[PDB]
A paper describes a structure:
In this study, we extracted extracellular fibrils from lab-cultured Bacillus amyloiquefaciens, a Gram-positive bacterium with great potential in biotechnological applications such as plant growth promotion, biocontrol, and commercial enzyme production. In this study, we use cryo-EM to identify protein fibrils surrounding lab-cultured Bacillus amyloiquefaciens and discover an unreported fibril species in addition to the flagellar fibrils. In summary, our study identified two protein fibrils outside Bacillus bacteria: the extensively studied flagella and the previously undiscovered Vpr fibrils.
The amino acid sequence from the ModelAngelo model was then used to search for proteins with similar sequences, and Bacillus amyloiquefaciens Vpr, a extracellular S8 family serine peptidase, was the top hit (sequence identity 77%). Vpr proteins fold into four domains: a catalytic domain containing the typical catalytic triad of serine protease, an insert domain visible only in the cryo-EM map with a low threshold, and two assembly domains mainly responsible for inter-subunit interactions. Vpr proteins assemble into fibrils with a helical symmetry and a C2 symmetry. The fibrils are held together by two sets of inter-subunit interactions, one between subunit n and n+1 and the other between subunit n and n-2′ (the C2 symmetry counterpart of n-2). These inter-subunit interactions are predominantly hydrophilic, including hydrogen bonds and salt bridges, but there are also hydrophobic interactions. The relative position of the catalytic triad (Asp186, His230, and Ser531) suggests that the active site of Vpr protein is well folded and may be in a functional conformation. The active site in each subunit of Vpr fibrils is located in a cleft on the surface of the fibrils and is accessible to the solvent. These observations suggest that Vpr may maintain its peptidase activity when assembled into fibrils. There is an inner tunnel of ~23 Å in width at the center of Vpr fibrils, and extra densities are found inside the tunnel. The shape of the extra densities is a straight tube with an approximately circular cross-section, and the diameter of the circular cross-section is ~15 Å. These extra densities may suggest binding of unknown ligands, which should be negatively charged, as multiple lysine residues surround these densities (blue arrows).
Author numbering:
A (entry chain B), B (entry chain M): 158 to 348, 477 to 802
C (entry chain A): 269 to 348, 477 to 802
Write the structure that this text describes.
């Protein structure tokens, strides 16, 4: 917290007076220890709510709880957002509200998270922080719908992208929402001295069924020190270093609070567009720009975002999929440039796309009067006879009088996207003794689905089940415990592999935590 | 009194001969020292009544009274209204009546105020002044019903808006009446030279349950010097400078007296419409027009009001709330233009509203013969799919042959109004020793209500009580002094916070004057 | 303030506008250029100076880079070996960046001009003084535009620009060579010829842009418009020429335009990438009508990458933190490689301040810790900094005047 905040530009904003004063930030996590000396004065009279216990004391889970283990995630997040004292948060003047929706152990029902989001909207929170999330790449999860309900009731919503290894299509459920700032995690420049680099546990887009580019923005989220409860009666408050995509989002939440103090008239979508427009692209060690669904738009720069008189929205656009077997397919999008300045300006557009057979064009120049809005019609055209199937990343760059005002990441997919055909599988005991239930998630259905059984030594025992023409979503199958048909398994410990084939690609997933016969 | 009266136009009216002669003004306050040389000749034979003492001597509370402290509010108000001598009131020829309804200390029962109002109507008072008031935003308080009973028995009623910081929905009880001129306080232009500005202690509308725009008009009410009793036997009369919304109303009372002398045929509602129609809109320091529920219609201008041959009524209108979830909702109002002149005129209407999704239309022109009346049908239409929830301010402007004859402030609210869900809370000792009674006021009920306890250091001790589905109005709860259930408090000094959540918004209020365990 | 002045001049009904100001950023989309293009569409002719920079291409100023405004260069009147008219060596020269437009649009006398000045003396506050500069060539064209607008009250601002630019005398230098198009524009104004003109060719000058093809032939075409303001049907004859080998020009060799009507001529240029040396080539479209020549349209094309300065300006200021510095530089089209080098007061190479790669175009800011070659601190004194930018196969450098202090 003493090196990331200078990097994103927090101190420079502080010396301009913008520290988040008057802005109210809600932290929907495992609860906040609102007695840490660094957090004491940032909490108002009403501290928040505790949905897992239904009381007005959103304290973290204590040590020695029958239902689970003690937690410190929420206090760390709150210290990252707004901590005043020994450690200075990104916006060390914002009011805080704590909403304990994740019970002991860090697990919480979806209904509790929805209730927390709605109650945070009730309590007048201007910025909302969600460092939770499951691993279902569905833009229409309940937590994502709730997050899109806010960001329309004037509440900016910042969420973590999720913690999954370097792999596309692994973005979490709340971080798949169409209108919410999803944040990925980066490593600060460390000494062959390296520049900023994305951590290899940040979830990566695109989102399924919408092909939206995620994360929206990246922020420092590796080795972040912040306030924690020590869960020790001798000294209950201390500092600890945690890492995760769940701790990149608090930086963006603090940035949003600072910006909202600086620009009190900006809507939640305008703040998202301002953070996303003024962001530094990140190159990896070799020197290649990180893919758009690993970076979003780059690392935040609070100082650039605060001083921005032109906003390009949406900050990133996705053209979807091009499925035509032959011929040329043309799609177009209308970006909107808001000229917040008092002077008539001329904006210049440069469209680019990687890959052959993709031709991009559109409005090469607009003139927008003061305090007005102009529209630029970007247009992409894909020649099905020349384009190899795959995901291609483009960019719309907006220049105005020297400086660059935006760099909009665009994306299109040719033929069928290469998403995992099957995402998760688990095996539980059935309602009848000796039988089992297999629950699997198919993002877009499966032309063919096969369950195979492996022993504890990962030796192929046989074939549990075969199924055809499965509907997308959650699928449940009853399995009688017998392999290849009528062959009963010997007693022991087993793994199951789900192999799903759909639309010309196949994927597989193995059950961790082996089930017992 | 030597700078505000020239500003509102009192001297110019005096040189026209209009000084309020023959008009009778009643001052329902803490009593009037009717021996100040500036007030001696304005009082008739019968000076008034003293309801807190039941005698015909409405003298102010003397120094050294067991029941309270000496008062000087009423004498100051009376000097502001009509003082002839060293200080010249707004209408320095009007007869005065004093009605002592507020006892020592400035506190008075509601029944005494109602009795004072009714007795002032008895005594033939033409103008009535109420510089008292509690802080309950209820249009149907007893004092407001009594004030609406007058203004129908031909008695103009001018009341203060109340003294509450810059915050909507803080207008006081008598100043919430549907038919009475409620006055806010302004600062005279002082030297970066500033124009007129509203003081930051004037209560602000709208009124609850009627959404009426208040204050009705603003007037100079900051640093007003006027006659006071010094409560010194050596020299009992002097001059003093007081400030408050309670001292903006006397200017409007004097203005009403002057107008009633000038226009002897105008009804109380016609006087209210004439003051409200010809009023100068006030802009703040930056250059933005003050919101309608901070200004009403602007500062009075007695000279413009006196010379007005067209009256638009009601002077301000409120369209209420638009609650439809989907579709378009249309409301309409009929304003009435009275053509007091001897010549047939043509009035031109311009309707405007701030905010998107609100379309306003109606009669764009009327022709009214001499000494007749025309009706204009303003119509507003709200598209529920495009309008953000909130309070929007509009305006109907009436032009006639050059000059503008009126500027009617209009207002509508979309979805649920953002009133404080809980207004006041206090804790007293219960009928049983060791127990307590919590009295709270909920303007529109509460879906959920919570009482929380804080120590003298404002540290959250615990949760006093939880309640659901509470009815609106005054609510009383018995509290056994035990926290979180069955946990008794240690002895000391405590504060209580009431948190009320209703209809998608939550509010909180803290008990000043901590209670003792 | 300049934008406000332009807009208020449009408010006040000004028919002709004169801007003798301007910075030195070769950007056609500067704010002052956008404001100047807003006028010339609200019926207001806009005449601006080209700028005051030595004889060097790509040095035209910001307001004088606007797409629709008469930019004026400065000339010397014929003085006695008697010389003819000659362009002054301080007039900024085109082309404009990112549009490759030919500038100045026209040249006018702007050397040793005597005119009214305030003496700033209470004894006698008014007098006459002789000043020189491209900023004083533009007032001649502004007066010419006023005279023409009185003579032709129906002409649009673009028609006036085309009439001034069409009837202009080409200028030859001392040796006898025609001045390049981005030093002359179209020649010196001739108000009398412009006032008596019944045919207008628009645009008065055209630029074909750049030809980037590595192999093959690339063809571009433009449509010029001839307005026949006379009462008689006329026949216009077109002659297209280009300097340099491998460039073939063709198009409509003759049009017939009825009275008070408009015709279109389709000029076409074709560049053989296998035969053409990279560089900037100047062409001309000449329109003849019944004897006299009615227009001489300067055309221009660029082959491969234009030879603009890769870095235009650099300055060093003190940073927000004491002991550190901020370097602000302007890169017209970005830089593949950018290097900041430090020199002592004696212009001796002290070392290498910073290295950067893949820089975006426009204004770039770099924080410099005051240490050279890495971890080597400078001794106290006075220093200069050189910016070396390499992009698209050419490199340029610029030195900081007004040395900064360590």
């Amino acid at each position: 917290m003493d090196d990331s905040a200078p990097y994103i530009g927090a101190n420079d904003a502080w010396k301009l007076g913008y520290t988040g004063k008057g802005v109210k930030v809600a932290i929907i996590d495992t609860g906040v220890e609102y007695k840490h000396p660094d957090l004491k004065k940032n909490f108002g009279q009403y501290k928040g709510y505790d949905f897992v216990d239904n009381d007005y004391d959103p304290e973290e889970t204590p040590s020695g709880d029958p239902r689970g283990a003690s937690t410190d995630h929420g206090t760390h997040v709150a210290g990252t957002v707004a901590a005043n004292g020994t450690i200075k948060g990104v916006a060390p003047d914002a009011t805080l509200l704590a909403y304990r929706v994740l019970g002991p152990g860090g697990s919480g029902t979806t209904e509790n998270v929805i209730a927390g989001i709605e109650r945070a909207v009730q309590d007048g929170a201007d910025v909302m922080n969600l460092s939770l999330g499951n691993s279902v790449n569905n833009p229409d999860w309940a937590t994502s719908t709730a997050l899109d309900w806010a960001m329309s009731e004037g509440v900016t919503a910042v969420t973590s992208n999720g913690n999954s290894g370097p792999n596309n299509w692994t973005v979490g459920s709340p971080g798949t929402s169409r209108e919410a700032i999803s944040v990925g995690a980066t490593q600060l420049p460390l000494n062959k001295s390296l520049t900023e680099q994305m951590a290899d546990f940040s979830s990566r887009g695109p989102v399924m069924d919408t092909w939206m580019i995620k994360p929206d923005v990246s922020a420092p989220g590796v080795n972040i020190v912040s306030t924690i409860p020590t869960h020790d009666p001798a000294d209950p408050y201390g500092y600890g270093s945690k890492q995760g995509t769940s701790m990149a989002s608090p930086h963006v939440a603090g940035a949003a609070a600072v910006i909202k103090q600086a620009k009190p008239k900006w809507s939640p979508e305008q703040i998202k567009a301002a953070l996303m427009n003024t962001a530094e692209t990140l190159t990896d060690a070799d020197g290649d720009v990180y893919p758009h669904n690993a970076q979003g738009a780059g690392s935040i720069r609070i100082m650039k975002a605060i001083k921005a008189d032109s906003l390009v929205a949406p900050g990133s656009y996705s053209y979807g999929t091009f499925m035509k077997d032959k011929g040329n397919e043309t799609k177009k999008e209308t970006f909107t440039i808001e000229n917040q300045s008092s002077i008539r300006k001329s904006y210049q557009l440069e469209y680019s796309f990687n890959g052959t057979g993709i031709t991009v064009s559109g409005t090469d120049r607009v003139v927008i009067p003061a305090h007005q809005t102009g529209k630029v019609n970007a247009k992409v055209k894909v020649n099905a006879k020349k384009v190899k199937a795959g995901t291609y990343e483009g960019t719309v760059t907006v220049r105005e009088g020297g400086k660059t005002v935006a760099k909009v990441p665009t994306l299109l997919i040719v033929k069928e996207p290469d998403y995992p055909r099957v995402t998760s599988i688990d095996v539980q005991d059935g309602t009848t003794q000796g039988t089992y239930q297999i629950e699997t998630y198919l993002p877009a259905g499966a032309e063919e689905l096969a369950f195979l059984v492996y022993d504890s030594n990962l030796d192929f025992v046989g074939q549990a089940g075969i199924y055809k023409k499965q509907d997308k979503g959650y699928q449940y199958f009853d399995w009688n415990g017998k392999v290849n048909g009528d062959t009963a398994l010997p007693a022991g410990e087993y793994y199951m592999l789900a192999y799903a084939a759909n639309k010309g690609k196949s994927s597989q997933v193995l059950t961790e935590k082996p089930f017992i016969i």
